[PDB]
Design an enzyme around this catalytic site. Structure first.
Site, PDB file in Angstrom:
ATOM      1  N   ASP A  89      45.882  43.783  38.436  1.00  0.00           N
ATOM      2  CA  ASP A  89      45.639  42.350  38.433  1.00  0.00           C
ATOM      3  C   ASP A  89      44.872  41.835  39.717  1.00  0.00           C
ATOM      4  O   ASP A  89      44.860  40.975  40.542  1.00  0.00           O
ATOM      5  CB  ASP A  89      47.560  41.077  39.192  1.00  0.00           C
ATOM      6  CG  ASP A  89      47.786  41.382  37.897  1.00  0.00           C
ATOM      7  OD1 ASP A  89      46.854  41.305  36.290  1.00  0.00           O
ATOM      8  OD2 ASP A  89      48.471  41.734  37.357  1.00  0.00           O
ATOM      9  N   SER A  90      43.849  42.524  40.139  1.00  0.00           N
ATOM     10  CA  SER A  90      42.625  42.375  41.085  1.00  0.00           C
ATOM     11  C   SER A  90      41.175  42.568  40.822  1.00  0.00           C
ATOM     12  O   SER A  90      41.373  42.845  39.375  1.00  0.00           O
ATOM     13  CB  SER A  90      43.252  43.604  41.660  1.00  0.00           C
ATOM     14  OG  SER A  90      42.009  43.775  43.101  1.00  0.00           O
TER      15      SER A  90
END
Ligand SMILES: [Mg+2]
Ligand SMILES: [Zn+2]
Ligand SMILES: [Zn+2]
Ligand SMILES: [Zn+2]
Lengths: 52, 49, 96, 34, 240, 49, 46, 48, 67, 427, 258, 115
Positions: free
Chosen positions: J156-157
RNA sequence: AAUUAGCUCUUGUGUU
């Protein structure tokens, strides 16, 4: 100290031409808050030049 | 808030076209704070005489 | 999926084949109105799509009725999280 | 006459007319005015 | 009333005795970093220069400590306080006279946190024992905590806005305790279910599945490029 | 004289009632501002239904 | 000695001595804005 | 480290093309859903 | 607020084409035809002009803070 | 057709919605009366002659996508996502950086954020036409590629393009306003705006007072940083220093200063200080489908992968964020962004359309020389070699959430203490 | 163990872009030349701004950022100037900087368009790209608004900031027909032919070549207007060669002492 | 706040050696070059040229950390051929490559501009 | 070296 609170211009090095305000200084170096960046740097007094 | 009850927090069937079925806080007040739909209106009231 | 890094078989099934039945409190969509889930249906309809069965896939998109039913199904997950966290924290504190 | 399958334009024209006549904060302004 | 002052949560016993606010703590957002070992955490320069660690002067390390005291509090790898053995403390932010900068054997120096320091790294929903493991500090440019990906599972971290906390032990005994008890590699296998809590996650798992297939072939150049990244390689190229 | 009642902005008794966009711009008021809030001690307050 | 202030309504620069009521000479306005500083400002084009 | 550096060569992604069938599996899914609907209707009418 | 000088992705100058884009649009040109007449091949540059809102025009309506 | 025609030439004649109501064509139905009515979802589909289901309809919906709210109606293709993702997007739409009002230069609000280059979304819903989103947008259309490049976006980056950021991409400015007034504290206690002097103050720190001018206030354009006095206020007991200070670690430029009188006639000044924020790593970015993430690393233009031409992604997101979150609407929006950009027209993503689907969009895209599924052949930035897997890439609308890392970094080593229990303070 | 012999063939050359083909060289050299195209080519851009009076609707940093992105015609001054870090002088001298001045005042009721022609350079050989289609718009001013500033432009390359990037787009590509299988198409029939594809309309990709290496790289370098594209390529080659020579000197010094 | 200045990507500071050589101890005739303030631009070409040499048994490069501007090149050659002369021969070959390519490009640009 | 209580909003945990 005379240099504290003086608007200075860096004369040499990679930071040449950037103006700033001296916050704390010693007999060798000084601490300058930059007008163009949101950071404070440490610069030798030999590369410094007071303006106004 | 901080109540063990869960029935008022759920999405009732009657909330169709009246309240957005997706916009709600995800904190402790989930399902208790809601938003009006786009075309929803709220009656201002009138005299019944 | 086969590497197990993320996802599962049911994820591929819902994305491609069909979303499936929506459930609240372990049961189908209840009669929120009088003997019908939504005004778009007739009274006392126990058919698949009337009670909250989504026959479309996430790729094909959801029709408005099944979209609202899916929202109803998804609300319970957040509600369950918000209550279960506070319920189990007390149990863990008592144990320790 | 009826509108066969040329209905998206009308469907959004009526909504545009609604939102031109009544804004988005109509309920609060109406309640306070009354 | 006096009963309310200590009744329950936020009272003396629960809010001030069993749990307090502590010094030498930092809290920042976390970001991924696949170039750090599982027992390393990358901290920004500002946090390292803000919180210090006390070190005793000895003849073995008197020159390094003297140099650090000379550097002062402006430059990063410097000191902040010097504590005399008689309990007196001298601040290095007021540029005192050089006589005070002189230090002897029995003194202490509060030096800035440097590479290799042991820290406790915590995520607030502390559920099990592996939520407060120990890491080794590495200074990195930008202002986020960076930790290896395999250790994101015990912390239940997500790298999407999560903030974590860093505690710096202030004594040698505490440092040795954390180093011999709560370091990351020592906590790979949990006693809860006698199985590892750290695995291979995200795209590394997918790529290692695609990489060990029967039909994966590499030329010599890519083989050397990959072998360059092995820390434990013995320098011998295997026969193809 | 009885007392002062705050006025919901963009109401019938607000000074910004029925004015054109030119007047709002001349008054440093955004024509896109929906109104519907009070100003108490210089702070914008809204009432949740 | 005097400080230069700018009226918000009539935009006319007016001088006010210390410990004086804040009001514009014309249009009777109450809100005044301070003028830009006279020291040099340097921005890197980055 | 090794696997991440090999992924620079192999690469990995996900897109719309990975969510599409062969237009023959769609027919099978539609037929299955139709059969299920007919069976549920039969159960409903037998209950009625 | 104002049209960017350079395209974000590639860096091509796009800050000298807003007025030309508006002129082409008011000359009964479709947006795509105007964009390709302005020599914008890559869609990264096309989105810079196609999806731009000029808020400085609304800002200039307000009276200056100092005169 | 008569009503539709008369309503089309409105604002020329005087036909309006109220006239439509008076004609007895539409009616206001409340939730209690909805129980006893029969709704048709759409006129044509649910009122013709087919297998007799109801045949006794009484009302028809105007448009089904009107069940959504203000925040939920800006999601493109919201019926292709998972419902919690729609909820998350509804939540995060209220945190997106953007021009919150046109006259933001006159309002001395506290904590004002505003982006330099907001953009109208390349793909929009019809509903957001009435939300004035095309006139006050919040976000930028960025060339997003869904791939695992280096590993700095694994969970989730996102990976940001440094060269793009240098060109003003997602650069923003954050305002902050300080208010302070002089007050009659008492007969002998009285604050006043005045520059302290090293010969008349007993309680005073090493704070420098030459930054502010003799009026007791800073001047606009003056660079300020932490532990700098802005308003010099001293109250008599010779005097006690009660001057205000800039918040620690702010480092901004004084934007403007306003001086006036309060309701009771005392002097009162509000000072706004601005600060330029660059999208450094740790900043939070979110899509329109609940795909929030933090910048992990920034690569310059040469390092990022490139297509056959010199097109490089502005943001690279991990594939693993997609399969578990059912954000197929994100993929569909990305696919239609290519068609909208090449064709040259803002696409339509109305929630319930039935005239737009993946097949037609793919067929349209295949006419512009691209792969119909949106994949492209990317070249590795470092080694220049082709990537064996074709990468999904296209323009997607992203928002910059207000949660920047510099507002959350914090550390302490023996700071202030509490008064009741001698423990470290809070906050 | 020795260097190979490359060949060059330019297929198009205009005032905005250069398309060419390179043969008999390794992929690493081609990619490094591409990266030097993008990043390491010296060029002149504004890097110092001092504002005397700004009463516009855009704040000072916004104006400075917009000014820094304006390209400047620097074709022969680039190799004559010195980096400001290396010039042994106090305050920018004309040997390491170029001075620009701007002074715009809007008095008439009509809006004023502060554009690039309002930048007044003190060196005729370095000007914004308006030598001979409007200008790069900088600011829009209303009546009573003024903007007075002075700037210094210095030398740099794109690795420091993207404002020193000379190229607008580098369209690198090799092996248009997938003979080497460097990329694998799951369904090869679904992909359009490449522009440089010498392949008949019947098949989609060339037959596999088990023993082959990347050759014949196709470049299409499109410049932003400051440097001529051929000058861009030549300067990039010279810069890469100079970096390699400096590395060689450093290695020789290190070895002669070790 | 913690942002490094841009010029740190390529500027050497006081006491920083451009290139450092360390003799590897695992295997004979193996050496490590530690180039400071560089990236893949030099590493890729140097590794490729070293691989072209038939007297090099191993040639690789890596960047230890993308936020740290330094590269490490490992070179192992057959006995009677030290890695140092292999490295300098690779550099000479690159110089010849670039000079020849540049002059050929000049000739071809002249030819294009003159029909 | 300059206080506190209350309220409100928001951030992470919402996985199979
Ligand atoms: Mg999270
Ligand atoms: Zn006035
Ligand atoms: Zn572009
Ligand atoms: Zn000079």
């Amino acid at each position: 100290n005379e240099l504290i609170g003086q608007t200075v211009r860096i004369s040499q090095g990679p930071y040449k031409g950037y103006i700033g305000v001296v916050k704390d200084a010693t007999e060798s170096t000084a601490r300058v808050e930059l007008h163009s960046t949101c950071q404070t740097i440490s610069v030798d007094r030999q590369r410094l030049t007071t303006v106004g | 808030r901080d109540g063990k009850l869960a029935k008022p927090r759920q999405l009732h069937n009657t909330l169709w076209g009246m309240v957005c079925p997706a916009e709600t806080p995800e904190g402790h007040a989930v399902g208790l704070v809601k938003n009006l739909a786009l075309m929803a209106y709220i009656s201002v009231g009138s005299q019944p005489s | 999926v086969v590497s197990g890094a993320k996802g599962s078989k049911i994820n591929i099934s819902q994305v491609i084949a069909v979303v499936g039945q929506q459930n609240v409190e372990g049961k189908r969509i209840p009669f929120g109105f009088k003997h019908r889930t939504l005004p778009h249906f007739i009274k006392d309809d126990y058919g698949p799509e009337s009670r909250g069965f989504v026959e479309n896939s996430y790729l094909a998109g959801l029709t408005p009725t099944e979209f609202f039913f899916h929202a109803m199904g998804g609300r319970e997950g957040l509600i369950d999280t918000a209550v279960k966290t506070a319920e189990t924290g007390y149990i863990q504190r008592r144990l320790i | 006459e009826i509108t066969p399958d040329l209905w998206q334009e009308a469907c959004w024209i009526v909504i545009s007319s609604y939102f031109d006549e009544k804004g988005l904060v109509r309920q609060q302004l109406d309640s306070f005015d009354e | 009333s006096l009963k309310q002052r200590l009744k329950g949560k936020e009272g003396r016993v629960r809010g001030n005795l069993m749990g307090k606010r502590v010094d030498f703590s930092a809290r920042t957002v976390i970001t991924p970093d696949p170039n750090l070992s599982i027992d390393q955490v990358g901290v920004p320069r500002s946090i390292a220069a803000n919180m210090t660690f006390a070190e005793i002067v000895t003849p073995f390390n008197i020159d390094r400590l003297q140099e650090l005291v000379r550097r002062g509090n402006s430059q990063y790898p410097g000191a902040k306080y010097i504590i005399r053995d008689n309990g007196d403390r001298i601040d290095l932010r007021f540029h005192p006279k050089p006589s005070d900068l002189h230090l002897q054997t029995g003194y202490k120096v509060e030096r800035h946190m440097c590479d290799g320091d042991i820290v406790i790294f915590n995520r607030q929903p502390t559920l099990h024992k592996m939520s407060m493991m120990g890491h080794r500090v590495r200074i990195l440019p930008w202002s986020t905590f960076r930790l290896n990906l395999s250790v994101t599972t015990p912390y239940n971290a997500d790298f999407d806005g999560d903030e974590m906390n860093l505690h710096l032990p202030q004594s040698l005994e505490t440092r040795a305790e954390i180093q011999e008890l709560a370091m990351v590699p020592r906590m790979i296998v949990t006693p809860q279910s006698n199985r590892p809590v750290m695995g291979i996650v995200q795209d590394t798992l997918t790529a290692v599945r695609k990489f060990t297939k029967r039909d994966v072939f590499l030329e010599r150049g890519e083989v050397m490029n990959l072998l360059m990244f092995l820390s434990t390689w013995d320098g011998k190229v295997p026969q193809p | 004289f009885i007392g002062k009642i705050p006025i919901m902005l963009r109401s019938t008794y607000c000074l910004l009632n029925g004015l054109t966009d030119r007047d709002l711009c001349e008054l440093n008021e955004c024509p896109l501002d929906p109104g519907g809030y009070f100003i108490i001690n210089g702070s914008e307050k809204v009432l949740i239904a | 000695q005097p400080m230069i202030y700018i009226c918000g309504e009539c935009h006319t620069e007016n001088e006010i001595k210390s410990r004086d009521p804040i009001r514009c000479r014309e249009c009777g306005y109450r809100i005044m804005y301070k003028k830009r500083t006279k020291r040099l400002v340097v921005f890197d084009a980055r | 480290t090794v696997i991440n550096n090999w992924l620079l060569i192999e690469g990995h992604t996900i897109g719309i093309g990975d969510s599409i069938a062969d237009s023959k599996t769609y027919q099978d899914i539609q037929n299955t859903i139709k059969k299920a609907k007919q069976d549920v209707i039969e159960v409903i009418e037998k209950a009625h | 607020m104002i049209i960017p000088v350079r395209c974000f992705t590639c860096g091509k100058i796009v800050g000298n084409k807003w007025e030309a884009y508006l002129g082409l649009l008011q000359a009964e040109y479709t947006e795509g035809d105007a964009l390709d007449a302005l020599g914008l091949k890559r869609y990264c540059c096309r989105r810079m002009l196609l999806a731009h809102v000029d808020l400085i025009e609304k800002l200039l309506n307000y009276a200056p803070l100092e005169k | 057709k008569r009503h539709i025609d008369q309503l089309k030439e409105r604002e020329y004649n005087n036909y309006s919605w109220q006239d439509l109501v008076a004609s007895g064509v539409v009616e206001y139905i409340d939730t209690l009366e909805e129980e006893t009515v029969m709704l048709a979802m759409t006129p044509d589909d649910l009122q013709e002659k087919e297998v007799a289901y109801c045949s006794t309809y009484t009302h028809c919906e105007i448009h089904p996508s009107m069940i959504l709210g203000v925040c939920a109606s800006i999601i493109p293709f919201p019926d292709h996502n998972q419902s919690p993702r729609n909820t998350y997007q509804s939540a995060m739409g209220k945190q997106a950086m953007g021009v919150y009002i046109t006259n933001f230069h006159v309002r001395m609000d506290t904590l004002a954020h505003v982006l330099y280059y907001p953009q109208k979304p390349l793909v929009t819903t019809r509903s957001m036409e009435y939300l004035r989103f095309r006139e006050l947008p919040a976000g930028i259309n960025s060339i997003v590629a869904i791939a695992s490049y280096t590993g700095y976006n694994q969970e989730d980056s996102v990976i940001m393009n440094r060269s793009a950021v240098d060109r003003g991409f997602f650069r923003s400015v954050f305002y902050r306003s300080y208010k302070e007034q002089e007050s009659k504290k008492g007969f002998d206690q009285e604050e006043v705006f005045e520059k302290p002097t090293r010969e008349t103050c007993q309680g005073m720190r090493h704070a420098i007072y030459d930054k502010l001018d003799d009026d007791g206030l800073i001047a606009p354009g003056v660079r300020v940083s932490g532990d700098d006095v802005i308003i010099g206020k001293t109250v008599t007991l010779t005097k006690r220093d009660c001057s205000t200070f800039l918040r620690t670690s702010e480092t901004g430029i004084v934007d403007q200063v306003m001086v006036t009188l309060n309701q009771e006639g005392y002097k009162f000044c509000k000072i706004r200080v601005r600060s330029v924020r660059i999208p450094q790593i740790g900043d939070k970015f979110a899509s329109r489908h609940g795909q929030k993430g933090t910048c992990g690393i920034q690569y310059r233009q040469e390092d990022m992968p490139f297509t056959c031409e010199g097109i490089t992604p502005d943001i690279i997101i991990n594939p693993h964020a997609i399969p578990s979150r059912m954000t197929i609407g994100h993929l569909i929006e990305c696919l239609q962004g290519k068609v909208s950009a090449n064709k040259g027209e803002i696409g339509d993503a109305t929630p319930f359309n039935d005239a737009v689907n993946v097949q037609k969009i793919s067929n349209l895209l295949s006419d512009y020389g691209y792969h119909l599924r949106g994949n492209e052949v990317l070249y590795n930035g470092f080694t220049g070699r082709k990537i064996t897997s074709q990468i999904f890439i296209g323009p997607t609308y992203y928002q910059r959430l207000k949660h920047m890392v510099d507002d959350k970094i914090h550390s302490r080593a023996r700071g202030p203490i509490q008064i009741l229990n001698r423990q470290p303070m809070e906050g | 163990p020795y260097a190979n012999q490359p060949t060059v063939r330019i297929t198009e050359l205009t005032d905005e872009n250069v398309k060419f083909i390179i043969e008999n060289t390794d992929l690493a050299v081609a990619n490094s030349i591409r990266r030097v195209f993008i990043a390491e080519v010296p060029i002149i851009a504004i890097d110092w701004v001092q504002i005397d009076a700004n009463s516009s609707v855009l704040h000072d940093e916004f104006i400075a950022h917009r000014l820094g992105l304006i390209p400047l015609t620097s074709d022969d001054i680039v190799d004559k100037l010195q980096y400001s870090r290396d010039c042994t002088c106090e305050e920018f001298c004309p040997e390491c900087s170029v001075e620009f001045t701007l002074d715009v005042r809007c008095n008439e009721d009509q809006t004023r368009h502060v554009t690039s022609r309002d930048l007044i350079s003190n060196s005729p050989r370095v000007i914004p790209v308006t030598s001979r289609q409007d200008d790069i718009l900088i600011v829009k001013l209303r009546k009573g608004q003024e903007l007075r500033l002075r700037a210094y432009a210095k030398k740099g390359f794109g690795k420091e900031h993207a404002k020193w990037n000379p190229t607008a787009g580098v369209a690198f590509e090799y092996d248009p027909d997938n003979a080497l299988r460097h990329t694998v198409y799951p369904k090869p029939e679904e992909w359009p032919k490449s522009e440089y594809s010498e392949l008949d309309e019947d098949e989609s990709q060339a037959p596999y070549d088990p023993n082959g290496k990347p050759e014949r790289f196709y470049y299409n370098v499109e410049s932003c207007g400051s440097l001529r594209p051929e000058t861009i390529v030549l300067s990039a080659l010279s810069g890469l060669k100079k970096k390699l020579s400096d590395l060689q000197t450093q290695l020789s010094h290190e070895i002669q002492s070790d | 706040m913690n942002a490094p200045p841009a010029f740190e990507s390529f500027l050497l500071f006081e006491g920083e050696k451009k290139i450092t050589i360390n003799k590897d101890t695992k295997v004979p005739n193996a050496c490590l070059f530690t180039i400071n303030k560089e990236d893949h631009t030099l590493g890729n070409i140097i590794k490729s040229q070293l691989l072209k040499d038939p007297q090099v048994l191993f040639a690789g490069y890596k960047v230890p950390h993308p936020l740290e501007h330094k590269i490490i090149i490992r070179v192992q050659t057959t006995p009677d051929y030290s890695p140092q002369e292999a490295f300098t021969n690779a550099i000479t070959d690159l110089i010849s490559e670039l000079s020849l390519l540049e002059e050929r490009f000049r000739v071809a640009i002249k030819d294009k501009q003159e029909g």
